[PDB]
Symmetry: D2
Subunit: 357 residues, 4 copies
């Protein structure tokens, strides 16, 4: 019958995000998916450093926090293995030894500066007890734009899912998926490549199968929400958990099993265009983190995306102990740091050898 | 096959919100749905008062803002027609002439104190140009809880939808519905009866039919999201636009047409349990606002919910002019205010007579 | 940016079903919602009559099936209490004693002829064991159009939901909702008022609360799918189960409890425009059926729709026994039939008195 | 709070289809994804042969239909290039020259026998004029099981989408996606590998960009529905249209552009586990079909799935003309058939040379 002239942008089929940063976002994703490189996640909260530093009797202060980060960021040669670093908000404004801001410093070393833009976990208040949402969308663009102006080119936002009794509430599944998808859009509009982090927590007694089933359900909805919001696929990354048995389940999965379940889960849910998957390491030992990624990278299952790491403790633990919080500890700390980074770089290439650890 | 023991709260069918404030929320809804009463919407932004006050040469200051509100809130006898007032955040902390906070003052007069808890409109960044989302969910509970502690018992949050070319994007429809539904839950968990405001804007050249079609589509999704979030139906209110021709469409609908289209649209979308519908008046003249509500209240269509008003300018315009911003103007301003309030009180009872205006 | 001219029918907001039968469907709904009247459900399968007739030693034959129906349909004066009858496909083509087809006969008596258009239950093959879908959408219009040509003006389609362990699968919830919603559209396009039957089965040991929770979840999705398909609300009816304790739960709910839970559940889910709710009686005794509907009709909860009955066994049981399958039994059978029909007619008016049974 | 024991099958995360045919379906997919092989689509309706045969003055009869098919199916050596054939229902029951049923015959030649199980296109009756749904789910399993018993191991079902004014209705997008997803499940439960065909039609004046945008939107929803129904990803295939300019748009896309847009669209929507994509050729010339697939197979974009053909006219046109419907024409017809099949086999390997045509 009747015809009406509308904006094409009002049509469901024409909803892909329109951002003038498109091409630079893709260029950043190419940098972030450089073979044999991965990301250093150095976005730990101020708060967390208190516990972190106790073992090394380092007081949790702003300057000592800068020194902890500089331990890794000014470790000469890390660039060979790290393509970008997810910075904490505080660190963005900190200076390296030469006076440059960390973002300036990294960039000049060819490393992309990134920033954790989420505002933390809060009770979901829907769903099951212990479920949590993530805050930070309010005023997002203003924040992201100032980060961009400071040299950041990518960001990270984490939502969690807690397996309890073998399942998670649909409330969580949907709502957290929606939060991730909106964050990805606002990031892209702000000139930041969004790394979308839907972490199914390792916590619990559940088995690998449960972890598999829950991850596939959770991630499929994250994808469904990202398609609903029209994300630029070519310009985003995923940082999921690997599929492993629960922390207290009593069992440890062999590398090949982990690879099998992980790669399978991803392929079942992620669109083939997804450029890269940078795994989180939570709850894994420094060495498993590397062994697991290596096996992932030897999997015969479909995996068109770059598979690599985005690790925190798995790159830092040994380093911090050797460093011990002292200037005199830099060298040793840095050797441990570089070692881990190399092991993971090999792991990304599927050439890791446990003999090297 | 296999059986597993779960939390009932992990089951889709058991998702209704669980809040210890349930009974008080229902009690507040009973107060808010008192026959022949409606709400005064006094939640105008600070900013807005600048333009508001220009005509009366009243400087936009904090004290003059308090005086503008006190013009209405301390008008003796308004309680006969107003069951609650939606306060602006600033006003919540302001004192009436007797030293009591406005919330204290209203309560003692038997009027429920309410608060606009949204954080304003922002570009949607999905969908069509000119579409907007609403911010404020971050830190919502902390804010709502402090309002509750100050005597507030209900809140208001407004999302808008802009008809362009006869339609609105699905992006808007879904996302704004989701925002409204989450806000309603958090409100309820915070002990505030949420008034859910999905305003299809009057702006444009569209006709009554288009307004009808868009409102029904928009509101149906708001309902769908509220069911998804498990709202306590018995404890919320709607504040929709009436279904009328567009502001610039060149046509004016008669009261009965407006009633027909409005009541029809609601009944088609709103669950019968919805306790009350407090209409917004945007773009209507003070007198149409009353005439339209009266006709609504004479409609032969189904309408189990209480149908009343939540007006701002439609209750205030005459008052402000008569008041003129001067102490000496109180009396006159208050008579105009009381008049409007009475006309709308009659309109809620379906006994309004234009002869009285 | 770019503008494009489209069919308005391609716009999400303009999706309400467009049928030239609109006005006649509404006229049929007005007939079907006549105060103090309800529907006789006489759509039992051929198969079922075998068991049905065993007690009365009546052989299950086509002619005896015609006689069973004629027992009720030619009972003079039933029209005072029955506004329409849901016929079985076979009966549509059967003749009353005067040579007229049943549809012709009913119409001339002012009773609307209806037809069960579903094709029966089948394993869902998704979801949990024992869940079932409903077939019959293929070739639907051709069938419905021939029924319309034969004098039918309304139809019935039943989907079931089986509570097991306190829940039903989302697979069932969605899929059956989709089936109901599509059937309603095709019916309307075919000039038949669709009665949408989402029966949460009485079967099991579950309690009234579980029945409540499951019904609300199931029905909310039926509504969500009907809105998605653009149904003409003004032109459809619901035939739900009442909310009662499970058949084997060991408990019997009092009439007022049943009314409370039932009316509440409906109001929470059904749009206020829904014209009528004609309850199914499955598993209730002839007398509870009447007592329950009466209480429903005295409920103080919101219920803008006409609340009445669509009963089968609850109108027939006594009748069939008195009839005993013999011509000589007509009189007695008809008195029992008329009695039940009157009791339910009173029940619709909320004036049923158990003293009368 | 409370715990309840349920069937794991009642949990959203445990919804993957459970079929005893799982392993054989995967084995069939391995056969169907043999390097350098593709499918011959010989599922043309009886009706269609009338027009098909006019040019060759062959009467449309059952026997001449058998002869048309036998032209290709008994062409010695086609097996080198064809891994399976999608048969028409009639052909399933036809015999090759040696007395074996076609399915028997193909199997013995190592070619998988398949069957088109959809029941045809019908007006959608929702959405925009000219939109169509696909029938055939009713009694699906009974039909599919008898096909399986006759030697079929895979099936095909086609739904279409018509670009009009640059878009398609959400009604179509959702409903057709739902139909495809349900068909895939029932197929799998019936021991048939389902080839899911969501054809965005070439028809119209739209450009390549529009085709891109619509295909991505349409296919993303097909994926979303398949995940909702729990399909066995490892056991299904896609048969989409390539992304090209509209038939009447006046423009012809070069092979590399087609490859770029096509592979991009798929990767953006299809899960990496999807085993294979067998393109439809509708509206392409025999030679473009081959050139386009070849370029597809040289694309540098991500494409973990096997990319090949499922062609009808693109494999048959030359053959039918040379055959001319005469026994004496077999030889020539078969050489043309074999030629095309070889060209496409090369195209699958990305080694097609136009010089060979």
């Amino acid at each position: 019958m009747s015809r009406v002239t509308v904006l094409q942008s009002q049509l469901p089929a024409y909803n892909r995000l329109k951002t003038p940063y498109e091409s630079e976002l893709i260029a950043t994703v190419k940098k972030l998916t450089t073979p044999g490189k991965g990301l250093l996640a150095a976005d730990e909260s101020i708060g967390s450093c208190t516990k972190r530093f106790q073992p090394i009797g380092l007081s949790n202060t702003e300057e000592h926090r800068r020194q902890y980060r500089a331990l890794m960021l000014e470790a000469e040669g890390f660039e060979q293995y790290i393509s970008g670093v997810i910075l904490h908000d505080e660190t963005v404004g900190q200076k390296a030894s030469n006076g440059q801001t960390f973002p300036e410093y990294l960039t000049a070393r060819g490393v992309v500066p990134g920033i954790k833009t989420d505002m933390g976990l809060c009770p979901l208040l829907e769903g099951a007890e212990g479920e949590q949402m993530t805050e930070g969308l309010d005023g997002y663009v203003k924040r992201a734009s100032a980060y961009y102006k400071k040299g950041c080119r990518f960001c990270k936002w984490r939502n969690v899912y807690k397996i309890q009794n073998g399942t998670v509430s649909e409330s969580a599944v949907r709502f957290n998926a929606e939060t991730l998808a909106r964050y990805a859009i606002l990031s892209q509009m702000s000139g930041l490549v969004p790394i979308v982090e839907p972490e199914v927590m390792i916590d619990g007694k559940h088995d690998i199968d449960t972890c598999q089933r829950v991850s596939e359900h959770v991630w499929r909805e994250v994808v469904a929400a990202l398609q609903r919001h029209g994300v630029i696929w070519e310009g985003c990354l995923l940082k999921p958990n690997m599929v492993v048995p629960g922390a207290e389940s009593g069992k440890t999965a062999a590398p090949e099993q982990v690879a099998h379940y992980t790669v399978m889960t991803l392929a079942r849910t992620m669109p083939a265009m997804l450029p890269g998957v940078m795994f989180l390491s939570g709850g894994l030992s420094e060495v498993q983190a590397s062994e697991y990624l290596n096996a992932i990278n030897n999997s015969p299952l479909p995996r068109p995306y770059f598979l690599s790491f985005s690790y925190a403790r798995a790159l830092q633990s040994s380093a911090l102990k050797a460093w011990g919080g002292k200037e005199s500890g830099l060298a040793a700390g840095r050797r441990a740091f570089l070692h881990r980074a190399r092991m993971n770089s090999m792991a990304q290439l599927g050439k890791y050898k446990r003999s090297d650890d």
